[PDB]
Each structure stands twice: as structure tokens, then as C-alpha cells.
């Protein structure tokens with residue numbers, strides 16, 4: 023008799039409800055992504071898989087607007103890629119500076135502390151962005167080798183201006199790493215033209231692919247920092263010298279490394295195809311249009327924006343101050359139960375303070391906005407008020 | 409819409425429809441997907457912390473407890489692949505200066521030693537020739553010599569086709585105040601393993617071998633003794649996103665906490681894989697693997713091919729290493745099987761590179777028909793590939 027019996031809970035079929043996902047992520051899957059969902063497996067090193075990897079690389083290069091050959095997929099999620107960037111770029115004792123204007127800069131600082139960097143932070147109140155003058159003051163004070171800046175701050179609903187920051191860093195012999203997990207595909211970014219040295223994003227926000235994989239690109243200046251290291255990075259399986267060879271970024275010959283997530287790659291390939299077919303300008307315009315419609319409905323319902331400066335409101339994820347007198351969990355639950363729409367509360371410094379509404383890629387439509395606006399109106403008239 | 413003009417154009421290659429060929433994957437991994445797992449790949453998305461996802465996660469935990477044969481509450485999925493889980497184990501279990509002992513009998517022990525060296529452990533290796541396993545006596549001599557806090561042992565050595573006996577190793581380790589960490593990536597579901605009963609403190613496996621799930625996620629379990637080593641560290645582990653103290657809370661192993669976005673689709677696939685094993689039952693799954701392998705071995709012997717592993721009792725049921733026949737170019741054989749029969753097999757890995765062919769019979773694929781298919785392909789490759 024075996025110690026542990028077959029779990030009764032697994033004896034029933036798997037079913038998932040049909041919902042409209044308008045939170046900060048994951049987003050709903052695009053039809054072409056859904057169609058790729060039941061493709062068969064092939065060997066991860068076979069010629070057809072190497073071709074899919076090359077197409078993905080080309081797609082990443084297009085969406086990032088980079089020619090960097092060290093552009094690839096990291097086999098992990100949400101912000102994970104963040105560890106790949108920091109483990110490779112930072113050595114013990116290196117001066118590291120973060121734009122801590124929300125949960126993401128704080129998390130980067132935590133990761134850098136774990137690997138022994140000398141971590142410095144420009145701390146700003148949630149809802150705020152960094153000016154060039156503020157960044158210059160941090161660079162001059164801390165003399166960092168790397169600056170971490172968040173483009174789309176999903177915890178606070180802030181979009182950071184990017185023009186000029188990379189060249190400012192280069193004047194201080196500092197590299198610029200940008201997080202565009204919540205912004206890529208929805209907000210203009212020109213990695214090379216803006217002087218961004220390292221950038222990462224994820225599959226499950228604007229790209230409408232399943233969560234679990236991430237996108238990263240390092241320029242040759244960043245690669246030079248990695249090759250100048252005294253020691254190997256702490257992780258073998260995110261070591262960019264190994265990943266570069268796996269992904270064919272150093273010419274013809276590969277190296278055996280890990281088993282890549284083949285079905286996730288199929289989905290990402292389709293997601294990138296969709297963006298390439300629509301074109302970035304049209305993608306950027308659709309997000310601006312969807313968000314403008316949402317902001318009009320929010321103002322009409324009497325909801326207030328967490329971000330006071332309209333010019334720094336992130337198009338893709340909007341932070342709404344919880345309405346006075348209501349329990350925000352009642353609002354979220356009402357929308358879920360009566361309309362089958364997912365929205366969220368806050369994150370990090372905005373926990374208990376806001377609602378977050380995401381309009382991401384395939385989901386950034388005025389029709390979806392109309393649906394969540396109706397749900398919120400009904401929640402406001404029925405949820406208990408004090 | 410922004411401050412610059414787009415200078416990188418849309419890639420034309422992406423406009424072509426994505427299709428993949430239909431092949432039988434009989435290599436060391438990844439395996440073909442079970443029908444319910446293929447179907448799970450097209451399920452819709454839901455929020456990763458919604459009630460339905462938390463239920464799926466609870467069912468997956470129970471499934472992992474079943475296949476590992478453990479009652480350990482600290483049992484969860486690591487959101488990464490192949491032998492990724494290996495880093496999670498080592499980053500959490502080893503502090504700088506900790507004595508670490510590895511069973512280096514193939515590529516996996518070599519890899520564990522390299523990862524441990526990167527994080528500052530005092531690494532000691534028990535080096536054995538590829539194709540051999542460890543005796544209790546050899547392990548005791550290493551424990552006595554090096555006084556490790558942790559021993560790493562590979563159950564299914566996929567680079568050499570070896571299955572390591574596990575009875576007595578945990579108890580031995582515990583007599584030396586050492587924790588036992590086992591890699592069952594290539595053996596779980598195909599070879600008997602009883603985690604608690606065999607005194608294994610930490611164990612990990614992956615989704616893409618016997619489980620017939622897509623690559624990308626791994627399974628790990630830590631017992632109370634291992635949990636004590638982790639929760640008693642002096643410094644934080646190097647990775648926040650594989651820190652077990654945080655993953656334990658995400659997975660409800662204690663209150664719950666926000667951490668990373670879980671791979672929802674991979675979890676759907678894994679739930680279905682675990683459901684299939686639970687329906688079939690472990691004993692039946694072990695039997696079908698022994699039965700398929702016996703049939704393959706009968707075919708290989710009859711066609712003149714020699715086993716890389718000399719002792720039959722040490723031959724891993726799931727992945728067989730065949731010595732490359734004299735006079736042939738192994739690449740020709742592998743390409744012949746692919747081109748003429750649409751079957752994937754492989755060559756070697758690490759210390760067996762250029763030395764062997766590897767044939768995997770994993771879960772759904774461990775069938776008589778599949779063995780007969782690959783045997784036919786191999787007989788024809790031997791007839792038609794150039795031989796010196």
C-alpha cells in the first residue's frame with residue numbers, strides 16, 4: 023500500500039471560466055496565440071525550432087526597436103528577466119542606482135543587495151516620475167555603473183519619459199537598464215535611438231501571450247561590462263554567455279544548455295507576428311485611444327486618478343483612487359461576479375489605495391472599456407457605502 | 409506617435425503561418441504531449457491569484473505529493489525548466505563556505521558542482537566513470553572525508569543512461585548529519601521512488617520527461633530537516649525569485665503573499681499530466697516503462713547494438729544509452745531516423761558526447777508500437793548509413 027493515494031481532486035475534468043481580464047496582467051490571449059496553443063511538440067534543438075527562435079529574435083528586435091544581436095527569451099516570468107539583467111551586469115561592490123518610485127525599483131534594489139552590489143536609490147513618492155535633473159544628481163552623487171529605470175510603473179500607473187536618459191548615463195560612464203514589462207507594445211520606446219543599453223519585458227501584458235517567459239536585449243556596451251567581470255555570475259542558467267550561445271547570438275555554433283519552453287515560444291512567435299502586422303505606430307495609437315475613452319468614463323463616474331499629472335499617466339495600466347466610502351474589495355468582487363471582468367486593487371505602495379485597470383494589446387478596445395465602465399457604474403450604485 | 413521614426417522594419421518571416429512537423433519524440437526529452445495536455449495548451453487565461461487558479465495550484469501540490477510519494481507540506485512548482493530547479497535547491501540549501509558533496513558520474517553532478525562553486529560552497533566531487541553508479545560504501549567514504557551539509561545524487565542520469573539505487577542513501581546521509589538532495593528529472597513516473605520512505609530530504613523533477621507536459625516548469629519538495637537548513641540561513645539566498653521562504657507562501661505551504669506571475673498555461677498542462685498519472689496509478693506507470701524498455705532492449709541486442717551501461721540492473725528504464733556502432737558516423741544514424749521515419753533520437757551529452765545514441769521511452773510514448781517503430785528505423789539506418 024503506497025504512502026500517498028491518488029488525489030480525488032484530480033479525478034474531475036479541468037475547466038476554466040471565460041472572463042475579460044482587465045487587470046494589470048495577465049491579459050487575454052489573442053486568437054492567433056490561442057490557435058498556437060495546441061501545436062505539437064518538436065525537439066528543442068531541431069532545425070524548425072532554431073528557425074522559430076530566429077523569427078522570435080527578429081520580432082523582439084522589431085518591438086524593442088533594436089539591432090542588438092544579444093536579444094533573446096528568458097525562460098521565466100513576470101519581472102524575472104530582472105534577475106538575469108542584474109546577475110550578469112553587477113559584481114560584488116559595484117555601485118548600482120535605482121529609480122525607486124514604486125515597487126519595481128525597490129525589488130531591483132533588493133536583488134542587487136542579495137548579490138553584493140553597493141545599492142543606491144533615488145526615492146520618490148508613488149505617482150511621480152524622474153526628471154533628467156534628478157537623475158543627473160543621483161549619478162553625480164553615487165557614481166554608479168548601472169542605472170535601473172522603470173518605463174511603465176505597474177504599481178503606481180506612471181509612465182516615465184525616456185528621451186535623454188541613456189546619454190545622460192553615458193556621460194557618467196553608467197549603463198541604462200529599462201524595465202518595459204508593462205509598457206512594451208503600448209507606449210513608444212526606441213531602444214537604440216534612446217541610448218538604452220539593456221531592456222526587458224514580459225509575454226503576458228501587451229503581447230497577449232501566456233505568462234512564463236520574458237524578453238531581453240543587451241547592447242555591446244553592456245556585453246563589454248559582462249566580459250570585464252572578475253567572477254562568473256551566480257546563476258549558470260541565466261548566465262548571458264550561455265544564453266547567447268543557446269540563442270545563436272554569437273554566430274553559427276550553439277551550446278547545449280537548458281530545455282527551452284517550446285510551446286511558450288510558439289505563442290510568443292504569434293504574439294510578435296501580430297505586432298509586426300499591425301505595426302508599432304498603430305499599436306501605440308490604439309492604446310492611447312482606448313485609454314482616452316477609459317479616462318473619459320472614469321471622470322464622468324466621478325472617480326479620481328491616483329497620478330495627478332495627466333502627462334505621466336501610463337496608457338496601459340491606470341491607477342484609480344479607491345472611491346471614498348466603499349470597500350474596494352466589494353467593487354472588485356462585484357465586477358467579477360456580475361460582469362465576469364477581472365480588475366485589481368493596488369500593489370506595493372498602492373496596496374489598499376487604488377483600483378488598477380489594464381488595457382493591454384488585444385484588450386485595448388473601446389468596447390472593452392464600455393464593458394468595464396458599465397460594471398463599475400453598477401458596482402458604485404449597489405456596493406455598500408459609508 | 410512618439411519622438412523618433414521607426415528604423416527597424418517589421419520582419420517578413422513572421423507573416424508566414426506557424427506550423428510544426430508531426431514527429432515521434434523518442435529522445436531523452438522532451439517527449440510528445442499526452443492528448444489532454446495538448447488540449448490544455450489552448451485553455452483561456454484567468455488571473456493567476458483568482459480562486460480557480462488557487463484551486464488548480466492546490467490540486468497540483470497534491471499531484472506532486474502523490475508522484476513523489478511525500479507528505480511534505482513544502483511541495484511546489486518552480487517556474488523554470490530542464491534542471492533549473494537544481495539552482496533553486498542549491499541557492500536555498502547552500503551558504504558560502506558550506507561543504508557540498510556531489511555524485512559526479514555524468515553531466516548532472518558536474519553541473520551541480522559548477523553551480524555550487526558559483527555561490528561559494530566548498531565543493532567536493534566523487535568522480536566515477538560515465539555509466540557507473542554509487543555504492544553505499546563509496547558515499548560513506550565521501551561523507552566521512554568531506555563532512556558535507558548536503559549530498560547531491562542523480563536518480564536518472566540522462567547523460568549516461570544510469571539508474572542509481574536509492575535504498576539506504578538517505579539513512580546513511582543522516583548518520584553524517586547530511587541532507588540528501590535527489591534529481592529525479594529523468595526517472596520520476598518511470599522508476600520507483602518513495603521520497604519519504606527512502607529518507608530523501610529534497611527532491612526535484614521536471615514536466616517534459618515522463619510527465620508528457622511541455623518544458624518550462626519543475627516540481628520540488630523539501631522535508632522538515634531541509635526546511636530547517638533553509639529557514640536558518642545567516643544571509644539571504646542570491647535569488648529573490650527562487651527564495652523558498654517566498655515561494656512557500658505563494659503556494660500556500662504555511663499566510664499567502666504576492667511574488668511572481670505564475671506560468672498559468674504550464675500549470676494547466678501540469679495539472680492534466682498529474683491527473684493522468686493519478687488515474688493510471690504509479691505502479692502501472694512503472695510497469696509500462698519496464699515492459700517497453702525490455703522490448704526495446706530485446707530489439708537492440710538482436711540488431712548487434714551494445715549497451716553503454718554494462719550492468720543490466722543499472723540501466724535506466726526511461727533513457728537507454730547505446731554505444732555508437734563501430735564504423736558509423738552517429739550523426740548519419742540520427743539524421744537517417746529523422747529523415748526517413750520522422751522519429752527523433754539523440755546522441756550523447758557531456759561525458760557521453762560522440763560516444764552514444766540515446767533513446768527515451770517516456771510516459772505516453774512508452775509503447776510497444778513506438779519501440780517497434782524506432783527498432784525498424786535503426787535497422788534501416790544500420791543498413792543504409794555509410795560504414796567504414
Ligand SMILES: [Cl-]
Pocket residue numbers: 049050051451452453
Ligand atoms: Cl484568454
Ligand SMILES: [Cl-]
Pocket residue numbers: 061062063439440441
Ligand atoms: Cl506532441
